[PDB]
């Protein structure tokens, strides 16, 4: 019923690794501070996204069991979840408590960041869907780990090995949901349901970036490998 000693160890351990990320305040601070041109915004995105991938790799490598996976599967897992993890982290930052009105400003800044209207709709649709879940810090971290250790990812040769690693994280997440939100016996399933919506950002991610309202679309060497651009 309650978390075992081992499950608390895993949770805290995963929480420690997740905290190594760039703090939410840092992101929202710069966005709210001053309106940037679509040019400056695109450059902010690439630098933010490059840092996020670097930290994501270090986070992934510390996930219990990931080191014993086939080297090519390791690559396949990171390459397949990098974009989803980035939008999930954006969702967390977007729905974080800010002073009155600020949330409207942040949303307005992003809406006019230079991103194509074509993609502004689904992105905010997902962001809002996430906010309605009243997720905790531990939930975001677990969900991100679950996203990374997805066995049903492409090019994965040994899916059973990945499954074994994802199971314990799901069990912990499930217990958390049944505790932090006893009133909603659908919270856990609803968290898992957002992951499918999260996957839709994969197919038209490159188009989303290339359609940025700027003249030049330059990315970092690391982003070129992880994303499908340039």
């Amino acid at each position: 019923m309650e978390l075992t000693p081992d499950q608390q160890t895993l949770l805290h351990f995963i929480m420690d690794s997740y905290n190594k990320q760039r703090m939410p305040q840092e992101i929202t601070n710069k966005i709210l501070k001053e309106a940037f041109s679509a040019e400056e915004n695109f450059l902010i995105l690439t630098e933010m996204a490059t840092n996020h991938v670097q930290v994501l790799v270090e986070f992934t490598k510390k996930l219990p069991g990931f080191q014993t996976l086939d080297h090519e599967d390791q690559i396949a897992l990171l390459k397949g979840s990098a974009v989803e993890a980035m939008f999930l982290r954006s969702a967390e930052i977007f729905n974080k408590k800010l002073p009155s009105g600020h949330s409207d400003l942040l949303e307005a800044r992003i809406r006019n960041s230079g991103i194509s209207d074509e993609y502004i709709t689904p992105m905010f649709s997902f962001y809002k869907s996430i906010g309605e879940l009243k997720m905790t810090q531990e939930e975001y971290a677990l969900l991100t780990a679950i996203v990374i250790l997805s066995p049903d990812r492409q090019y994965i040769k040994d899916r059973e090995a990945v499954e074994k690693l994802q199971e314990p994280l799901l069990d912990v997440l499930q217990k958390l949901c049944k505790i932090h939100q006893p009133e909603n016996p659908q919270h856990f399933a609803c968290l898992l349901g957002r992951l499918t919506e999260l996957r839709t950002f994969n197919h038209h991610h490159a188009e989303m970036l290339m359609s940025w309202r700027v003249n030049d679309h330059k990315f970092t060497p690391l982003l070129c490998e992880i994303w499908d651009v340039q």
Binding site: Q54, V57, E58, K61, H71, Q74, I75, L78, K79, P221, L222, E225, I226
Partner: peptide, 12 residues
């Protein structure tokens, strides 16, 4: 070839 990713996954 994903050599940057491969590097980060090996010796940082």
């Amino acid at each position: 070839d994903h050599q940057l990713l491969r590097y980060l996954l090996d010796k940082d």
